[PDB]
Design a protein around this ligand. Structure first.
Ligand SMILES: CCn1c(-c2cccnc2[C@H](C)OC)c2c3cc(ccc31)-c1csc(n1)C[C@H](NC(=O)[C@H](C(C)C)N(C)C(=O)N1CC(OC)C1)C(=O)N1CCC[C@H](N1)C(=O)OCC(C)(C)C2
Ligand SMILES: Nc1nc2c(ncn2[C@@H]2O[C@H](COP(=O)(O)OP(=O)(O)NP(=O)(O)O)[C@@H](O)[C@H]2O)c(=O)[nH]1
Ligand SMILES: [Mg+2]
Lengths: 170, 163
């Protein structure tokens, strides 16, 4: 089989959106921070035996330019909501991203996955239980990831694909 | 009189042309003095050799990171950051020189030259000068940009100083 999905990575500045994407696409990590304006990637993967093209839109963390960001959300089929486990503000910001997606897509049932990134760092400020409870209250999956160690990177993106696949075929 | 500074712009090290700026010391004196001193290098650091790392056609040419050389850094002559001085002047069209920042009161050394009116930045970025001569050089720099700001060749301030 062959399918294609438009995935959009959102979340506050510095949480690891690009580092997660580059680990999935190019299988490497660097400490250097290159702030994003906008980047797009294409990768062919096999998930549960089903081949797919992933189109990944790596967005900037900033939330201005609503006209452009609304279009990101209209076009995207599934969204990674990324926060960093050592950035409490980035976790507090998550509900804004979800509210914007529901508003733009006029729906309470949009494929999304909550991603707690930088799990390798010993400077945690957001409890796993807090994030688990929030994802549960949203009815969406939660995954902790590290772009540095690659922990959970494939699972985060593959889980979002499974959420989209479910949505499309239901 | 308002001071004037110049940038000699280079493309992969080859001279492109000169851009000169009027700095509005009369209305934004603290911000103009920072840019002036960074252009002459008289504090022991400044713009010479640094890159226009983000050029987006239809919007602006941004540069000034001489500390990290990757678009995240820079510092002022007053310390790492200084306050927004005032918002008297607005982003009224091509040639406006204005401070880049990461939110309120985070001015350092990064700056941008507008290539169009960018009025949505009014009241958030401090306008402190304008291109005097060389808008055609700024238009050339703009052609090296792209949608996400990455440039097709490396655009640098090969030389700079006060006229
Ligand atoms: C939605 C897409 N999109 C658009 C846009 C909107 C409509 C239509 N089409 C587009 C583009 C072409 O569609 C791809 C923009 C745009 C701008 C940004 C991000 C995405 C954007 C963006 C990112 S950061 C910024 N804007 C302000 C930036 N600050 C820094 O670079 C600082 C440095 C000075 C320290 N850093 C790095 C930082 O703040 N960090 C936050 C972190 O802290 C640790 C790092 C700054 O002062 N300027 C000087 C003023 C123009 C402005 N850049 C800029 O580039 O505007 C681009 C422009 C005008 C096209 C707007
Ligand atoms: N230790 C650690 N550092 C990480 C991790 N993910 C990203 N980083 C680091 O955090 C910084 C910011 O990462 P980056 O992916 O650019 O964040 P972003 O969300 O894309 N930022 P922006 O919104 O500006 O595009 C970089 O220095 C990067 O190396 C991670 O899982 N662990
Ligand atoms: Mg990024």
């Amino acid at each position: 089989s062959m399918t294609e999905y438009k995935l959009v990575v959102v979340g506050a500045v510095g949480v690891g959106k690009s580092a997660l994407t580059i680990q999935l696409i190019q299988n490497h990590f660097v400490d250097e921070y290159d702030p994003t304006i906008e980047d797009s990637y294409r990768k062919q993967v096999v998930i549960d035996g089903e081949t797919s093209l992933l189109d990944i839109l790596d967005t900037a963390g900033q939330e201005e330019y609503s006209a452009m960001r609304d279009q990101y959300m209209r076009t995207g089929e599934g969204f990674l909501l990324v926060f960093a486990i050592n950035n409490t503000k980035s976790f507090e910001d998550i509900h804004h991203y979800r509210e914007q997606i529901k508003r733009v897509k006029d729906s309470e049932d949009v494929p999304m996955v909550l991603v707690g990134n930088k799990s390798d760092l010993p400077s945690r400020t957001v409890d796993t239980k807090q994030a688990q409870d929030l994802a549960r209250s949203y009815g969406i999956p939660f995954i902790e990831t590290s772009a540095k160690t690659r922990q959970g990177v494939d699972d985060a993106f593959y889980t979002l694909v499974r959420e989209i696949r479910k949505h499309k075929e239901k | 009189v308002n001071p004037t500074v110049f940038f000699d712009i280079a493309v992969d090290g080859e001279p492109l042309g000169r851009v000169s700026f009027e700095l509005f010391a009369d209305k934004v004196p603290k911000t103009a003095e920072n840019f002036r001193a960074l252009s002459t290098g008289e504090k022991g650091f400044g713009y010479k050799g640094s890159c226009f790392h983000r050029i987006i056609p239809g919007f602006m040419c941004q540069g000034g990171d001489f500390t990290r050389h990757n678009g995240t850094g820079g510092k002022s002559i007053y310390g790492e950051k200084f306050e927004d001085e005032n918002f008297i002047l607005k982003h009224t069209g091509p040639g406006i020189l204005s401070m880049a920042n990461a939110g309120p009161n985070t001015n350092g050394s990064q700056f941008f030259i507008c290539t169009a009116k960018t009025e949505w930045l009014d009241g958030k970025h401090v306008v402190f000068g304008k291109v005097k001569e060389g808008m055609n050089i700024v238009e050339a720099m703009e052609r090296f940009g792209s949608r996400n700001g990455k440039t097709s060749k490396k655009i640098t301030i090969a030389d700079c100083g006060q006229l």
